[PDB]
Amino acid sequence: TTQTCGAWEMKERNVIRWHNQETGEQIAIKQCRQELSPRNRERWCLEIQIMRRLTHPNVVAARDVPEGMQNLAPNDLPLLAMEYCQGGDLRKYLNQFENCCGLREGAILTLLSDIASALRYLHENRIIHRDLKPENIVLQQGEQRLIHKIIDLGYAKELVGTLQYLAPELLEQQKYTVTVDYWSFGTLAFECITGFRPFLPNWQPVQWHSKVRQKSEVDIVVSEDLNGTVKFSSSLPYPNNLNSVLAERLEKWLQLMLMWHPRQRGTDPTYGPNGCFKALDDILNLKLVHILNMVTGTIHTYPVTEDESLQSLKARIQQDTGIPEEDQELLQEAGLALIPDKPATQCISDGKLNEGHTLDMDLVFLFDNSKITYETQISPRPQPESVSCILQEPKRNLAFFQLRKVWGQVWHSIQTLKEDCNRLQQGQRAAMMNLLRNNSCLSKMKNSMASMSQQLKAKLDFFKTSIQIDLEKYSEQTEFGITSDKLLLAWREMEQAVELCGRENEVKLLVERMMALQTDIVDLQRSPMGRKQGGTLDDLEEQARELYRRLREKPRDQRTEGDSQEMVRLLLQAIQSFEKKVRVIYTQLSKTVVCKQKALELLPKVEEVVSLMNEDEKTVVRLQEKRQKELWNLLKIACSK
Amino acid sequence: TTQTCGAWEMKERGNVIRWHNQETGEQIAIKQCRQELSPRNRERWCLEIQIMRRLTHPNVVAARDVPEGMQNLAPNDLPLLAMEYCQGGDLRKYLNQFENCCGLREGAILTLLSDIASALRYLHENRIIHRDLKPENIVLQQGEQRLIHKIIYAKELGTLQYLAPELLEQQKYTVTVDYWSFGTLAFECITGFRPFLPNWQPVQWHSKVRQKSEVDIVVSEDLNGTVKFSSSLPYPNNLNSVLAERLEKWLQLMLMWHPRQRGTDPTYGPNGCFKALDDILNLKLVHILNMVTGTIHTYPVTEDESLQSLKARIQQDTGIPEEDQELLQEAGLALIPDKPATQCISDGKLTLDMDLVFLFDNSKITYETQISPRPQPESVSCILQEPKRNLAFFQLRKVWGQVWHSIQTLKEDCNRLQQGQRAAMMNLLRNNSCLSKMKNSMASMSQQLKAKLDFFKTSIQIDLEKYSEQTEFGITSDKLLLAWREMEQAVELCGRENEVKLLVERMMALQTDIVDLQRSPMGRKQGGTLDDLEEQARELYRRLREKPRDQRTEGDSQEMVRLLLQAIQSFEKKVRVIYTQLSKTVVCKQKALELLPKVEEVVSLMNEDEKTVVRLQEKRQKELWNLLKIACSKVR
């Protein structure tokens, strides 16, 4: 039973979509009810007129009513058209099995940058949404990145529904400023980072208002643990997908966004009242650089200005880690050395803040020149209170909704450990790439030095033979020619000077040392790394995700309580295999760095050897030229008689 | 209740009882006599005691003295006799092992034959016949180097398969009663099952042995239940070609119905099976694995068979001429002519899979990805065509064991092929190292030649420049400017830097090709996964053989058929890569042998080039010397 009004065909569901099968425009018409109250009818007309004014790109825009659609209207009031977004609401993205513990870093950054710049324009036109939920935010597939648009607006005074995203001012029905949106944003952001609602997970608003009035402004997360004890924590809970500076700045911003007093909410102590837009813009504009210290295997995030010198940031890293700037070795994904004075902010040269943020490529690995071998242990990863409490007793039959949370946290921890292993493996591979480059250069220099040494040997033999024949023939002209002991001594002096030289033995020593070095280099070049070797960790991650999906597949009638023995077993197995693999990674890393140092030790040996053999060849040529000059001068003088 | 008396304490068994000494540590086996015996049996037991006391052959258990003070502890009024305890155990347990379900290994059967025949001949020499022989009487005593088969009723002149028909039909049996009793035994040592009538009653057994022809050796019923008399040695045996054929002929000579015809060899007269089996054992068999077809051929080589004659026979059989034949060992060692083909050296440090020699062809450039699969017996094929056949437990045991043995054989063949490829790679690597050394030598010679040419041209350029000043003052006779200009124009001709560069690039490409797939094969193998599949099958096969008689139900064989098909697919998949690498290896070996004489002739020419440069320099120096000396001494 499908009905159309021309070319536009009706689609399924407040707002209903109409797709054109000849022009191709999917316009969403919002239908109005038939029984309207006078004040509500006037407000509906006001909303109709207001929608034509707002045309922000980061929010859904109002489109023209098709010609001939007012005729098929039961009520005398015009329905409004909109743009259909193929993406869908943010709620489905949040409920995905991969984003159970919050979205990726890039997704959160794009969400903030797309929502704040639209909310500023909404507040500029004296329009307040007064309601904001993940269901209103749709992820429209843009030209380059996904754009966060806002559908299904509400009401507003010119300057009542059903949902759990309520600000306290909606409960008190008191004089509210625009800050009611800010709060509704902040809570949302929390579930976008950690995965759960910040204030009272699935608790009724009745005690929620009291527990919000009781909490201090610094405490951001209000939750009860496995026992059932209320807790107010000021720090951002784990496990989030953010780095250090991101977590700290966003925790301060969240404290600035979650306040009880309406006029004090959003009041930034730097950008005046309601200056959260500029604070968030300053947070987003911060060029963060990730450095992976391989000695301890720790990731450090640093905020770098547009023109912060490389040496100053290296000094900051030296102060933090403890390795001086001289012994610092900064390497890229393929054994690429960083620019030695132009700032290393080119490590994110793409600079398009990819929606699928990949902090495993935009990081720079740091190695030490002083240490010869590296340690295997890099310490494990921290775990939240619930995860530790369920690890101490895996046989705790907790509720279904608590088990969902803790199992998701365990799966996220396993995936994080796998990612850390991949990053360390990539760092060692990059070190090997740099070593291979140096080895190729040293092989070319070895060939050049061997060529020079053999040429010198040939020239010495030829010169010695020539001078020996000259000395033999000199004694046969002494009977009737012109004889002297003046220039006879010069030939003997050169005869001793040729014996003074000769670097064949040192060259041979260097050749066997270089040959041994290259053979061990190729011996550890054979070792494969790219294809994750003993890829047990990925299969363990697959088991964890399969178990998590199986838990979320049982219908509501099978949602029974049980123990978490199997997932704890999987986590312990993953930890053991992770350390076992990291041990081999660091063994190969030490094997690589020792040979790199040996190559850099053998470089100046050959440098000085060739710099000496060059002058040796020069002297040989000079001696031959002088002997020929002496003979020609003697002939010229004798021809005068 | 007579637990111990002195140092010798009884331990366990109930005909013979073991007695261990608490001071010497010797386990003596005493054969005790019971009390209710008939008198004629009493005189015969005393006679057997004395007869056992005289015989002391090494391949049979020997009699040791009864210790002093044992006559008091005797249940019978006549002295009992002692024997030697063997720690090894009976042959029956070795036959019932899960690894020897389809017969013993080749070496085990050879040792069993060589240890039983040399003792049975001495037993027959003293007019003593055992009249009974079963695997329970044969113990595998741990010898000094190899295991020795010793033996722990007799008249002096389930329990019937190892008994000859002349004794079980209550007929007068001659020494052939042992011979038949041996022939059956060896059969279960090769195939795994009893030769004559599996699970048949002795009543009809006599008739079914009378019905079979003398050539038919195996009498068995298939899955349906139809009696069959096959003359060829059944599969899967652990023997090679000539071993299987010659032992089949010997089994036909050993399994005959007529008493006078049994053991009658048409070469060594009647009852000359000992020397015929010795001739079979003395045959030096050499195994050659043709890699083009991937087939194993066994050849019997006499004491003085020429290498070229055997190569001609292999050429006639396989089809590769003697010139194109490449005989290689496990580590790339060539069969050096013309020392005898001693590579099958069992006397060395040291299984027919180690003394094997691989055969390669020079004519063929690339080898095929498939060498065809292996044949399978009729029962295996019949159970593969229908895996859902619920057959009896004792038939399922046989077919499942045969399937497991076939899987193991495929794994062994894969190992043989991989070892052959690795040996070819080793042979190629030796030549590659030699060619790298020659490359370095040639580069050194070329650089020396370049340096000498530069030195010579510099010197002659300076000499020509100084020649002009002398051509203006009177002492200049242009009778030798020709030599100077000829030297200048002639030394420029030498120099093959471009040819040397081409040869170096080709040699470098060859070396890179050598190292390209050097680390693709190794001692480890992806075939391990197939072995893991094989392991699963054997474990499943053994586990089902543990269920007691109340759970011994009939079922289907779907899982083992699936495992066999998976193993076959992976076997072919691995063989494809093996032969790909083999073709790459042979082509690179041919490329190295092609690039060798190029550098040989190049260096043989550069040597004379260097000689000519030296001669020209010496001539210039002599010329200038002579001119100056004569011109200056003319004035004086």
Search chain A and give the residue with CA nearest B520.
A526
Dihedral-angle region of residue B542 (phi above 0 means left; psi in -120 to 50 means alpha; beta otherwise)? alpha
- Report the Cα B394 to chain-centroid distance in Å: 33
Do B537 and B558 fall within a single domain?
yes
The count of structural domains within chain A is 4
Domain end, chosen from B54, B84, B114, is at: B84
C-alpha R_g of chain A: 38
Domain end, chosen from B253, B281, B309, is at: B281
Q: Is A252 annotated as a binding residue?
A: no
Do A152 and A259 fall within a single domain?
yes
Do A76 and A95 fall within a single domain?
no
Pick from B443, B456, B635: CB nearest A641: B635
Search chain B and give the residue with CA nearest A528.
B519
Could you give the CA distance from residue A435 to residue A593 in angstroms, rounded to a whole number? 8
CATH number at B31 reads 3.30.200.20
Pick from A466, A480, A628: CB nearest B463: A628
Pick from A457, A458, A624: CB nearest B459: A624
CA distances from B215 to B207, B212, B245 (A): 17, 8, 13
Pick from A450, A473, A638: CB nearest B625: A473
One of B77, B115, B132, B463 is an active-site residue; which one? B132
CA distances from B601 to B17, B496, B596, B606, B608 (A): 83, 12, 9, 9, 11
Q: Both tokens of residue B542?
A: 């053994």
Could you give the CA distance from residue A371 to residue B212 in angstroms, rounded to a whole number? 84
Do A185 and A276 fall within a single domain?
yes
Q: Tell whether B406 is covered by a domain.
A: yes
Q: What technique solved it?
A: X-ray
Q: Tell whether B376 is covered by a domain.
A: no
Residue pair B385/B545 in contact by the 8 Å Cβ criterion: no
Q: Tell whether B101 is covered by a domain.
A: yes
Instruction: Verify cis geometry, omega within 30 degrees of 0, for the bond prior to A239.
Output: yes
Q: Which residues form the domain of A562?
A: 400-638
Q: Is A15 annotated as a binding residue?
A: yes
Residue pair A188/A258 in contact by the 8 Å Cβ criterion: no
Dihedral-angle region of residue B486 (phi above 0 means left; psi in -120 to 50 means alpha; beta otherwise)? alpha
Which one-letter amino acid corresponds to residue B282?
N
Could you give the CA distance from residue A259 to residue A577 in angstroms, rounded to a whole number? 45
Closest approach of A425 to chain B, Cα-based (Å):
21
CATH number at B106 reads 1.10.510.10
CATH number at B523 reads 1.20.1270.250
- 3-state secondary structure labels for all residues of B235-252: CCCCCCHHHHHHHHHHHH
Residue with structure tokens 């139900």? B553
CATH number at B356 reads 3.10.20.90
Q: Catalytic: B265?
A: no
Closest approach of B412 to chain A, Cα-based (Å):
27
Q: Tell whether B570 is covered by a domain.
A: yes
Could you give the CA distance from residue A211 to residue A199 in angstroms, rounded to a whole number? 9
Do B77 and B95 fall within a single domain?
no
Length of chain B: 636
Q: Both tokens of residue B131?
A: 């009249």
Q: Does B458 contact A639 at a Cβ distance shorter than 8 Å?
A: no
Q: Is A230 annotated as a binding residue?
A: no
Do A221 and A159 fall within a single domain?
yes
One of A131, A152, A181, A368 is an active-site residue; which one? A131
Do A271 and A360 fall within a single domain?
no
Could you give the CA distance from residue A535 to residue A554 in angstroms, rounded to a whole number? 30
Could you give the CA distance from residue B521 to residue B220 in angstroms, rounded to a whole number? 45
Main-chain phi, psi angles of B498, to 5 degrees: -65, -45
Write out chain B residues lying below 8 Å of A465, CB-based: 614
What is the residue-wise DSSP string for B106-159? Answer: HHHHHHHHHHHHHHHHHHHHTTB------TTTEEEE--SSS-EEEE----B---
Domain end, chosen from A35, A63, A82, is at: A82
Q: Does B632 contact A482 at a Cβ distance shorter than 8 Å?
A: yes
- Closest Cα to residue B580, out of B516, B511, B492, B503? B516
Mark out chain B residues that contact chain A at CB-CB < 8 A.
Answer: 443-444, 447-452, 455-456, 458-459, 462-463, 466, 469-470, 473-475, 515, 519, 614, 617-618, 621-622, 624-625, 627-629, 631-633, 635-636
Write out chain B residues lying below 8 Å of A456, CB-based: 451
**CA trace torsion A324, A329, A331, A334 (10° rounding):** -170
Q: Tell whether B277 is covered by a domain.
A: yes
Do A362 and A503 fall within a single domain?
no
Q: Does A635 contact B628 at a Cβ distance shorter than 8 Å?
A: yes
Residue pair B541/B564 in contact by the 8 Å Cβ criterion: no
Residue pair B632/A482 in contact by the 8 Å Cβ criterion: yes
Residue with structure tokens 């087939």? B295
Q: Tell whether B377 is covered by a domain.
A: no
Q: Tell whether B388 is covered by a domain.
A: no
Write out chain B residues lying below 8 Å of A458, CB-based: 447-449, 451-452
Mark out chain A residues that contact chain B at CB-CB < 8 A.
Answer: 450-451, 454-459, 462-463, 465-466, 469-470, 473, 476-477, 480-482, 522, 526, 621, 624-625, 628-629, 631-632, 634-636, 638-639, 641
Long-range CB contacts (within 8 A, 24+) of A337-345: A337/A434, A338/A310, A338/A364, A339/A310, A340/A310, A341/A309, A341/A310, A341/A311, A342/A310, A343/A304, A343/A307, A343/A308, A343/A309, A343/A310, A343/A313, A344/A289, A344/A310, A344/A313, A345/A287, A345/A289, A345/A304, A345/A306, A345/A308
Do B67 and B113 fall within a single domain?
no
Could you give the CA distance from residue B496 to residue B489 in angstroms, rounded to a whole number? 16
Do A627 and A513 fall within a single domain?
yes
Q: Helix, strand or coil for residue B533? A: helix
- Closest Cα to residue B534, out of B401, B338, B367, B360? B401
- 3-state secondary structure labels for all residues of B459-514: HHHHHHHHHHHHCCCCCCCCCCHHHHHHHHHHHCCCCCHHHHHHHHHHHHHHHHHH
Residues of the binding site of B for ATP: 14-16, 31
The count of other CB atoms within 10 Å of the CB of residue A73 is 13
Q: Tell whether B225 is covered by a domain.
A: yes
Pick from A455, A458, A628: CB nearest B459: A628
Do B532 and B586 fall within a single domain?
yes
Write out chain A residues lying below 8 Å of B450, CB-based: 455
Q: Which helix H or strand E contains B171, and what residues bound it?
A: none
CA distances from A196 to A207, A256, A559 (A): 18, 20, 20
Do A144 and A274 fall within a single domain?
yes
Residue pair B446/B610 in contact by the 8 Å Cβ criterion: no
Could you give the CA distance from residue A531 to residue A512 in angstroms, rounded to a whole number? 34
Q: Does B463 contact A635 at a Cβ distance shorter than 8 Å?
A: no
